[PDB]
Structures are given as C-alpha cells and as structure tokens.
Amino acid sequence: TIKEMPQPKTFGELKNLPLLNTDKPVQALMKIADELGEIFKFEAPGRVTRYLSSQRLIKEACDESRFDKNLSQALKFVRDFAGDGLFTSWTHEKNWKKAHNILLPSFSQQAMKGYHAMMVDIAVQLVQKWERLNADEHIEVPEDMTRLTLDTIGLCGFNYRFNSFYRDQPHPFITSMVRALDEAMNKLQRANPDDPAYDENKRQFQEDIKVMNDLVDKIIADRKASGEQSDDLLTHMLNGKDPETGEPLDDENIRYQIITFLIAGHETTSGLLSFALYFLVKNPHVLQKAAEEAARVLVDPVPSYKQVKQLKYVGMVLNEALRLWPTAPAFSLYAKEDTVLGGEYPLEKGDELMVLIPQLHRDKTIWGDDVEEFRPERFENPSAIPQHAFKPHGNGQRACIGQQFALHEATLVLGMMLKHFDFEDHTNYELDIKETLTLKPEGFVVKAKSKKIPL
Ligand code: HEM
Ligand SMILES: CCCCCCCN1CCC[C@H]1C(=O)N[C@@H](Cc1ccccc1)C(=O)O
Ligand SMILES: C=Cc1ccccc1
C-alpha cells in the first residue's frame, strides 16, 4: 500500500525553496498542510524533507528507536552562534549527553524551588510597572513579556540583571538576537547564500554574534571574580561533572551553553505568555475562571513555590495556548534505519522529517470539531489524550530540558497578572504572528485596570 505523497508547487531548479520567501514561513507551511494533508514532500536544491501534520504519522515519528533528532536548516544556521550547545548538537556528539547529564540537575524540583525567589523578583517588577501606568496608557504585551522572561533567565540562571524594566528600548542582547534569528530565517530561502549581495548580511550577522558573545564574557567574568556563593545554572556549567565521562564541560562548550540558555531560556516563554494573555482576553469566561483560581490560591503578597504548584487551571490555560501556537513550532527528525511510515510511506536510513507542531495540534481526529476553540479543559485528563498528540516541547531524550522552568515561570507570572489586574482588549486586537523561527504576537496591546491589591 505504498502511497505517492503530495508536494506543493515548484519553481524549476529552485524546487520548493521560494515558498519560504515570506516573513511568515511556518504559517505558509500550515496553509500548505491545510491543502495537501498529513504529509507532503518539500525539496530544495540538494535536500528533501517531509512535513508531517497528523498524530497518526507523528506518533510513529516519535519512536526513538526509529528516528533521532535532526538539525533542520534553521538549526544549522543557529549553530553558527550556538555551537554544540544542547539545542543545536547532534545526539551522537559527545557534548550532547555530557552537557545533558551535567545540566539536568539544574531543572530538578529542588533547583526550581531555589529559582523561585528570583522569579518573583522579576514578576514583581512586571506588576509594579503596570500598576504605575497612567490612565489610558496601555501595555505592549510581547515587549513586556520579553523583558520579564529575559530577566528571569538572566537572574535565575546566571545571577545577572539585564534590568529590562529600566529600559524603554530592548536590551542590546535582544536587538542582536532578534536580528540573528531574522537572518537565519531569511537565509532559509537563499538559493545562493555566498552571492556577494549578502556580504552585508554576513557582516551584520558577525556583528550580532559578537554582541551576544560580549555579554557572555561579562557573565563569566563576573561569576569567577564574585565573592558570593551561588548554586545556579551557571554554577553547574562551571563545576558540574558528568558521571559518565567524568569530565566537566570545557570553556568553549560552556560559552555555547550560555548563549543557548539565554536564548532558549526566554524567547519561547515570552511567546507563550503573549499568546496566553491574548487567548484570555479573547475568552473572558476562561479569564474569569483563571482569575478566580489566582485569587483563591495566591493569598500572600508574594507567591510561594507551593502556591504556584496549585495554580492548576492556569497550567491548563498555558497548555492550551501551547496547543494552538507552540512557540518553537517545528522540530526535525531523521530515520535511523530503513522504515515505513504509517504503512504507506517507505523511508531510507537518513531520510528527514519535519514535525509541523501547530498543524499536529489542529488534528480534528484528536481534538474534535471545536479544534480552533480555546478550551483549557481539554487538558483535564492527560490519560484521555492519545500518545504524541501534544508536542510543544519536542520528543524523547531530546525534549525540552527547560520545560518545568518555563511552565513554573509562566504559571507564577500569569497568576500574579490575574490576581492583580483586570484586562481590556481595548483595540479589539487582530492576531498578527511574527516569525523569527519562533512565533510571537506582534502589536498586541491591552489595558490593565488595577485591583489595587498590595504587594
Ligand atoms: C514555553 C517555552 C518553551 C518551549 C515551547 C520550548 C520548546 C522546545 C522544543 C520544541 C525543543 C526541541 C527542539 C528540537 O527537537 O529541535 C526544545 C529544546 C530545548 N529547550 Fe526548550 N522550550 C521552552 C522553554 C525553554 C526554556 C525556558 C529553556 C531553558 C531554561 C529551554 C531550553 C531548551 C534546551 C536546552 C533544549 C535542547 C534540549 C536537548 O536537546 O538536550 N527551553 N524546547
Ligand atoms: C529555534 C527553534 C525553532 C526552530 C523552528 C525551525 C522551523 N523553521 C522555521 C521557519 C520555517 C521552519 C521550517 O520548516 N524550516 C525548514 C525549512 C527548510 C526545509 C527544507 C529545505 C530548506 C529549508 C528548515 O529549517 O530546515
Ligand atoms: C539557540 C537556540 C534557540 C532556541 C530557541 C529559540 C531560538 C534559538
């Protein structure tokens, strides 16, 4: 029962590459999936991949005995500054499992309890900023959630204060990081990337990587000269020992991990909080239920670790926001051996797949007809959700190491947000999703009305 898989429109020798010549390539790929179905072939000069959109097929793709993590072209470009850090290393490179073993303890329960106070530090700065707005001023939502999430990973992970709420413009790190991600995304469709027409792109890229590495240098220098005993993510990078190889990370890999965790440790969480607030103001009944939980649980001026763990409906709000708009919207796999997908699509060892997460999460055979609705109650019982239907944090041993960090931060922050403010979608905002490999609302603004509850 070997099927012929569909393929979107081609452009001669450029094959499908020009379909990526858009500012919104993930959303263009979702529209193609809408048209072609659960699997389609996508070719570029010298490369083939297959985009999967159905839980039927993706549940097989998530079999780690058959498929391993692949570096997509996007991750190969990001590797230019993230190196063999955890996000952009191959599973078989020695530094992947070594850094995984050394850094996994930085995301244990005990580690999260130790991060909690500094998460509150930044969260209180956010609440205070909004309490201090004048009447009819508004909140620039993705901008403020980036301030919050960047500052949280800086402080909790590295004892470094980006002081984003003291800035009306983005921290230089953010400016260069966004420009580097923009460049990597635009480079995806460049048929001749070495054409001198991109000399300036290349120079700018190098400049943005330097800016990013200069901050890394400062973070490292401050820690090794410090007279305060820390026990954070950076402590583990500098001192942790891999039980298997027995070795600590070397200096070159440490710098890659710092870059990796500064970027991965905030960008996707700012997208999540932005989408979550968007869906909450667009679904006032859901907002009310979540606000009622926040009021009942957050009975102290400062939330505790234990209280955040009881914000269970807020947790489902965030999972439902990750369902509709997972902020790292795809991951890539390669076949470890010859194998057949879904009884219909034979693959050879080395063949590549892309998992198109926002389309997987719209599989009507899993979620039902109401798939576009924002209904956090879908997550009331994980046992009622089929295997591999919900993959916003990737798969298997290569799943997101920071998942608990992200969800604790986002649960804490959204809980305080709902405890302290009413929110108004005063412009009737039309969702506009900006792509920088990752996904985030653009131009999303709201008004907040203080409940005047002291901190
Ligand atoms: C809601 C926020 C987040 C989302 C949606 C998310 C999503 C993902 C996804 C899908 C992957 C797999 C990528 C692939 O297979 O190519 C991944 C990997 C990773 N994420 Fe996250 N992430 C989030 C937050 C974080 C945070 C806060 C950190 C750091 C504190 C983090 C650190 C990482 C790292 C290090 C990896 C690579 C893991 C490995 O392969 O060993 N992420 N994330
Ligand atoms: C950084 C965390 C999010 C990463 C998401 C990456 C996911 N891409 C973000 C933008 C679009 C999407 C994607 O489909 N990319 C493919 C594109 C591609 C396929 C075949 C040949 C050439 C290029 C790729 O990068 O290989
Ligand atoms: C370098 C890794 C990364 C991770 C998430 C978003 C952008 C970049």
Curated annotation (Swiss-Prot):
Changing residue 86 to E: Ineffective covalent modification of the heme macrocycle. Extensive formation of Fe(II)CO complex in the substrate-free form. It is found in: Cytoplasm. Changing residue 268 to A: Contrary to wild-type, significant decrease in the formation of the high-spin complex via substrate binding, and decreased substrate-induced reduction potential shift with saturating concentrations of arachidonate. Disulfide bonds: none annotated. Residues 1-455 are annotated as: Cytochrome P450. The record marks 268 as: Important for catalytic activity. Induction: By pentobarbital. Expression is negatively regulated by repressor bm3R1 at the transcriptional level. Changing residue 87 to V: Higher activity in the hydroxylation of highly branched fatty acids. Transmembrane segments: none annotated. Changing residue 330 to P: Enhanced activity with small non-natural substrates with altered product profiles compared to wild-type. This protein is a target of protein engineering. Its selectivity-directing and activity-enhancing mutations have been extensively studied and the designed mutations allow this enzyme to act on non-native substrates and/or in order to enhance production of synthetically desirable end-products. Changing residue 264 to M: No effective fatty acid oxidation. No effect on electron transport from NADPH to FMN. Slightly lower high-spin conversion with arachidonate, palmitoleate, palmitate, myristate and laurate/dodecanoate. Changing residue 74 to G: Higher activity in the hydroxylation of highly branched fatty acids. (9Z)-hexadecenoate binds at residue 51. Heme binds at residue 400. Changing residue 82 to I: No effect in binding affinity for laurate as substrate. High coupling of NADPH consumption to laurate formation. No indole hydroxylation. Favors omega-2 hydroxylation. In the N-terminal section; belongs to the cytochrome P450 family. Functions as a fatty acid monooxygenase. Catalyzes hydroxylation of fatty acids at omega-1, omega-2 and omega-3 positions. Shows activity toward medium and long-chain fatty acids, with optimum chain lengths of 12, 14 and 16 carbons (lauric, myristic, and palmitic acids). Able to metabolize some of these primary metabolites to secondary and tertiary products. Marginal activity towards short chain lengths of 8-10 carbons. Hydroxylates highly branched fatty acids, which play an essential role in membrane fluidity regulation. This is Bifunctional cytochrome P450/NADPH--P450 reductase. It comes from Priestia megaterium (strain ATCC 14581 / DSM 32 / CCUG 1817 / JCM 2506 / NBRC 15308 / NCIMB 9376 / NCTC 10342 / NRRL B-14308 / VKM B-512 / Ford 19) (Bacillus megaterium). The gene is cyp102A1.
